[PDB]
């Protein structure tokens, strides 16, 4: 474990994940570099900074996860895009 803001953590996580899916057609990799980030969220805001970020972007990032879950069950690939619509929105706001 290491000290990093959830802000910085999600920024470069989303960027790396997107490059793997969009750029390299690696849907295995993007799940790898995304599941950890989602894991933290599900465990808890500890600090006040992680609290407010969770109030701001927690819902979207959660819904984005359900879309990915939906992809896992259907293989549709338009669920993945509905997921990445939401990732793009939170990413765009955290810059």
């Amino acid at each position: 474990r290491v000290a990093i803001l959830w802000h910085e953590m999600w920024h470069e996580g989303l960027e790396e994940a997107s490059r793997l899916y969009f750029g390299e057609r690696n849907v295995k990799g993007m799940f790898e570099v995304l599941e950890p980030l989602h894991a933290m969220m599900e465990r808890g805001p500890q600090t006040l900074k992680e609290t407010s970020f969770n109030q701001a972007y927690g819902r979207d990032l959660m819904e984005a996860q359900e879309w990915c879950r939906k992809y896992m069950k259907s293989g549709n690939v338009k669920d993945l895009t509905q997921a990445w619509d939401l990732y793009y929105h939170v990413f765009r706001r955290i810059s």
């Binding site: 969009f22 057609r25 549709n76 690939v77 338009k78 895009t81 619509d85 765009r92």
Partner: protein, 107 residues
């Protein structure tokens, strides 16, 4: 290459300088007119910074030709788009794409 054909003209002097944010509304379709994606269906303009290899090449060179206000149809050959590999489930291999894009504003 990428082919730009005016649907509706802009001022013709306000071009997107490398490194600006283009706010645009687009509908993308495969050659035959099969719509695959439009920001106008979501009712939500798309934004991207020009030059950062953020979008496909036909967009990079296409939108760089546009001035604020202008609406255009971009015919992008697979080389300047998703190539032989496509993007599986949405854009097939080798697909010639057509984009209808309007440049709302620069920021």
């Amino acid at each position: 290459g990428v082919q730009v054909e005016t649907i509706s003209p802009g001022d013709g002097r306000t071009f997107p300088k490398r490194g600006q944010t283009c706010v645009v509304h687009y509908t993308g379709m495969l050659e035959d007119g099969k719509k695959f994606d439009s920001s106008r269906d979501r009712n939500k303009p798309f934004k991207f910074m020009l030059g950062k290899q953020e979008v496909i090449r036909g967009w990079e060179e296409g939108v760089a030709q546009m001035s604020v206000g202008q609406r255009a149809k971009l015919t992008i050959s697979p080389d300047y788009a998703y190539g032989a590999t496509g993007h599986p489930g949405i854009i097939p291999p080798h697909a010639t794409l057509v984009f209808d894009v309007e440049l709302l504003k620069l920021e």
